[PDB]
């Protein structure tokens, strides 16, 4: 009878479709390569049927075979045109079906002949779906072929719109072929790009702090032994120092070093640096004079806020401002005119070394997530415990100041004696704070009735047994992505205590060495994306590039931690040590 040219690159030479056509006494030429007009595969052809053909047809060919080129495409067009349609059908959660349509000059733009709705069960694998569709369309072709040959079907134009996908759009998703529909949608919900409608962060920390001063001005801000400052008192003194600093020429993105012990003067100095416009570099003065000398050299800091006592540990490296000299304080107590943007530096901290750069928007995002998460109110009282050279300090000070809470400085007297500290808290009625895993585990041993919440993380947490009523939370995150990026409420004991779910405006991805996504439950190198990412390492652009990358598929900016982890079925993340 008639000679049929069958085009495919993926499909077998013995498809149900080919056998049916041969059953009807058609000679079926099978071709899997691109062809041109001169091709001997185009001699004496009545119908062209194409099924997963991986090449376009020159206009020359489609015109000569107009009205006689059929394509088998397993999607409910115009949904899911182009490559890997069955997959994108699941991922993009489009309607699912199979379509036989004429071949137009453009990809999958030909008028429809027949169309069928298909269904996938939550339990089917993505390879199950791929087959179930090819099954459905092959059977459909056999049912309606006769109707197609005799030309008795009225082609109808495809509905406007649709989705289109390209060959390489699945690269990022190569490891997901054997995933379940349920398991695949779960992964999307955990790792898919942010939903539309969100706006950049438009505030700096000292903006929001000055905001909070006017709401709770007479509330206690910071306490150190018997001395205390209200938000109003604290704000005005920082302003006086900030005026002085901006007079000395502090400007946005400038570095100002602070070398002091935990004290009211420290909080004033920190806020004064921000309000002036710059970012503060905390230097614990117990560091070896070697480290201190380096931190001041690497840092471009021209100003140093410090004591008469620690003055000499800098060896005249820079201009010094005595926080105890009343001449370092201006008469003006007004808030300074704002000159900062959220992309300006807020602080620079050193890892165990390199200068990590953090911007205001990084810090704002963390505090704005912290307040509502832990339901912090001005009734709360928190401790300044961590060294002021670690990002754990930023949590202690900043989160609670924007909640109107009261900060209590922790002297070395009870820094180590947790029995004595606990007595502090029970007397003063402390309700919340962060303790590193080491210190936190110890504190579980002391009796406590003050706390409402305690937070840990930084090293692996292994014990949960606590005496007090308070809830307990384990967190995770590197200094490079601003304090912590994930948070878990500990409800029951675990052999591996999970580190929780991501915070506001942050996303975490588990990737192959190839940087491809990994199914829920499969380990990989944990990657961070979102508001938390800092500016990088100071004076270390080549190394910054190493750790702050532009993903090859998505083009998003991500931080490579070098930690192993995996997602649990309920959405929480599980730490699995370093990558080695």
Ligand X SMILES: Nc1nc(=O)c2c([nH]1)NC[C@@H](CNc1ccc(C(=O)N[C@@H](CCC(=O)O)C(=O)O)cc1)N2C=O
Ligand Y SMILES: Nc1ncnc2c1ncn2[C@@H]1O[C@H](COP(=O)(O)CP(=O)(O)OP(=O)(O)O)[C@@H](O)[C@H]1O
Ligand Z SMILES: CC(C)[C@H](N)C(=O)O
Q: Tally the C-alpha atoms within 13 A of residue 565's C-alpha that lie toward its C-beta.
A: 26
For ligand X, the closer CB: 96 or 275 = 96
Q: According to the binding rule CB under 6 A, does residue 298 interact with ligand X?
A: no
Q: According to the binding rule CB under 6 A, does residue 457 interact with ligand Y?
A: yes
CB of 488 to ligand Y, least distance (A): 9
Q: According to the binding rule CB under 6 A, does residue 57 interact with ligand X?
A: yes
Q: According to the binding rule CB under 6 A, does residue 431 interact with ligand X?
A: no
Look up tokens 């003050």; give the residue: 450
For ligand X, the closer CB: 105 or 322 = 105
- Stretch of 70-78, 166-174, 259-267, 470-478 lying at the interface with ligand Y (CB under 6 A): 470-478
Q: According to the binding rule CB under 6 A, does residue 284 interact with ligand Y?
A: no
Q: Is 440 left (phi over 0), alpha (psi -120 to 50) or beta?
A: alpha
Binding mask 486-505 for ligand Y (x = CB under 6 A): -------------x------
CB of 484 to ligand Y, least distance (A): 8
- Stretch of 103-111, 199-207, 238-246, 353-361 lying at the interface with ligand X (CB under 6 A): 103-111
For ligand X, the closer CB: 81 or 246 = 81
Strands 81-82 and 164-165: parallel
280 binds, among ligand Y, ligand X, ligand Z, none (CB under 5 to 8 A by kind): none
Cα distances from 372 to residues 39, 377, 394, 455, 457, in angstroms, run 69, 9, 17, 15, 20
Residues in binding contact with ligand X, number by CB under 6 A: 19
The three-point CA angle 106-110-116 to 5° equals: 130
Give the integer Cα–Cα distance in Å for 459 and 436: 7
For ligand Z, the closer CB: 211 or 351 = 351
CA-CA-CA-CA torsion for 421, 427, 432, 435, nearest 10 degrees?
A: 0
Site for ligand X in 69-98 (CB under 6 A): 71, 73, 83
The three-point CA angle 488-393-297 to 5° equals: 130
- Ranges assigned E (strand) in 302-411: 303-306, 319-322, 345-350, 355-359, 381-384, 406-409
483 binds, among ligand Z, ligand Y, ligand X, none (CB under 5 to 8 A by kind): ligand Z
- Ranges assigned E (strand) in 467-556: 471-476, 486-489, 501-502, 506-511, 524-530, 536-537, 548-550
Site for ligand Y in 543-562 (CB under 6 A): 561
For 7-42, give the secondary structure using H, E and C.
ECCCCCCCCHHHHHHHHCCCEEEEECCCCCCCCHHH
Look up tokens 């013995």; give the residue: 14
Instruction: Identify any residues that bridge with 363 across adjacent strands, giving them in sequence order.
Output: none
- Stretch of 19-27, 282-290, 329-337, 389-397 lying at the interface with ligand Z (CB under 6 A): 389-397
CB of 460 to ligand Y, least distance (A): 4
Say whether 50 sits in a helix, a strand or coil: strand
Site for ligand Z in 411-470 (CB under 6 A): 457-458
Which of 3, 66, 167, 578 binds ligand X (CB under 6 A)? It is 167
Give the integer Cα–Cα distance in Å for 578 and 564: 6
CB of 472 to ligand Z, least distance (A): 15
Say whether 412 sits in a helix, a strand or coil: helix
Burial 341-377 (b: 16+ CB within 10 A, else e): ebebbbbbbbeeebbbbbbbbbbbbbbbbbbeebebe
Q: According to the binding rule CB under 6 A, does residue 410 interact with ligand Z?
A: no
Site for ligand Y in 73-112 (CB under 6 A): none
| Contact between residue 475 and residue 455 where contact means Cβ atoms under 8 Å apart | yes
CB of 541 to ligand X, least distance (A): 33
CB of 496 to ligand Y, least distance (A): 10
User: Which pair of structure tokens corresponds to residue 347?
Assistant: 């602080």
Q: According to the binding rule CB under 6 A, does residue 366 interact with ligand Z?
A: no
Q: According to the binding rule CB under 6 A, does residue 479 interact with ligand Y?
A: yes
CB of 422 to ligand Y, least distance (A): 24
Name the residue among 118, 102, 17 with its Cα closest to residue 62.
Answer: 102
Q: According to the binding rule CB under 6 A, does residue 1 interact with ligand X?
A: no
CB of 446 to ligand Y, least distance (A): 22
561 binds, among ligand X, ligand Y, ligand Z, none (CB under 5 to 8 A by kind): ligand Y
| Contact between residue 482 and residue 500 where contact means Cβ atoms under 8 Å apart | no
Residues that bind ligand X (CB under 6 A): 50, 53-57, 62, 71, 73, 83, 103-105, 107-108, 110, 166-168
Residues that bind ligand Y (CB under 6 A): 352, 457-461, 474, 476, 478-479, 499, 561, 563, 575
Residues that bind ligand Z (CB under 6 A): 390-392, 457-458, 477-479, 483-484
């Amino acid at each position: 009878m008639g000679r049929i040219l069958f085009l495919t690159t993926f499909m077998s030479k013995g498809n149900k479709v080919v056998r049916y056509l041969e059953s009807l006494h058609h000679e079926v030429v099978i071709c899997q390569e691109k062809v041109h007009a001169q091709s001997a595969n185009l001699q004496e052809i009545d119908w062209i049927v194409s099924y997963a053909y991986g090449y376009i047809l020159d206009k020359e060919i489609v015109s000569r075979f107009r009205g006689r080129i059929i394509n088998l495409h397993p999607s409910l067009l115009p949904w899911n045109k182009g490559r890997d349609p069955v997959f994108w059908s699941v991922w993009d959660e489009t309607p699912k079906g199979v379509t036989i349509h004429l071949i137009d000059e453009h990809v999958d733009t030909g008028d429809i002949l027949v169309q069928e709705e298909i269904a996938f069960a939550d339990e089917d694998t993505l390879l199950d779906c791929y087959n179930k569709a090819n099954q459905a369309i092959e059977e459909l072709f056999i049912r309606e072929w006769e109707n197609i040959v005799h030309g008795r079907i009225a082609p109808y134009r495809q509905t406007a719109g649709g989705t289109l996908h390209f060959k390489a759009d699945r690269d990022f998703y190569k490891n997901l072929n054997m995933t379940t529909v349920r398991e695949l949608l779960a992964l999307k919900r955990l790792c898919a790009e942010p939903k539309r409608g969100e706006k950049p962060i438009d505030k700096t920390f000292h903006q929001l702090f000055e905001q909070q001063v006017e709401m709770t001005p007479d509330h206690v801000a910071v306490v150190d032994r018997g001395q205390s400052l209200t938000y109003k008192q604290l704000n005005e003194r920082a302003n006086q120092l900030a005026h002085h600093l901006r007079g000395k020429g502090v400007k946005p993105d400038d570095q100002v070093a602070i070398m002091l012990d935990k004290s009211l003067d420290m909080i004033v100095s920190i806020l004064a640096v921000m309000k002036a416009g710059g970012a503060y570099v905390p230097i614990d003065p117990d560091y070896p004079g070697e480290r201190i000398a380096y931190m001041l050299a690497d840092s471009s800091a021209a100003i140093l806020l410090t004591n008469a006592l620690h003055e000499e540990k800098a060896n005249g490296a820079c201009d010094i401002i005595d926080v105890h000299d009343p001449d370092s304080y201006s008469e003006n107590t007004n808030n300074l005119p704002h000159v900062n943007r959220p992309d300006d530096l807020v602080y620079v901290m050193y890892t165990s070394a390199k200068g990590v750069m953090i911007e205001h928007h990084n810090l704002v995002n963390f505090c704005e997530w912290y307040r509502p998460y832990f339901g912090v109110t001005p009734a709360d009282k928190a401790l300044v415990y961590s060294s002021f050279s670690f990002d754990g300090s930023a949590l202690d000070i900043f989160t609670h100041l924007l909640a109107g809470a009261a900060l209590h400085i922790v002297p070395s007297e009870r820094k180590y004696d947790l029995d004595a500290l606990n007595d502090y808290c029970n007397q003063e009625g402390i309700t919340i704070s962060y303790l590193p895993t080491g210190a936190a585990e110890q504190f579980m041993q002391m009796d406590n009735q003050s706390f409402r919440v305690v937070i840990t993380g930084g090293d692996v947490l292994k014990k949960i047994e606590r005496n007090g009523t308070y809830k307990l939370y384990n967190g995770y995150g590197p200094t490079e992505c601003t304090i912590m990026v994930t948070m878990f409420e500990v409800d029951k004991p675990y052999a591996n205590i999970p580190i929780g779910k991501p915070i506001d405006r942050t996303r975490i991805l588990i990737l192959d060495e190839a940087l491809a996504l990994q199914p829920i439950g499969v380990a990989g190198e944990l990657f961070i994306v979102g508001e938390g990412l800092g500016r990088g390492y100071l004076n270390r652009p080549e190394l910054t590039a190493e750790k702050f990358i532009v993903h090859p598929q998505t083009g998003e900016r991500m931080y490579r931690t070098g930690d192993r982890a995996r997602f649990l079925p309920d959405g929480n993340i599980e730490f699995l040590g370093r990558l080695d």
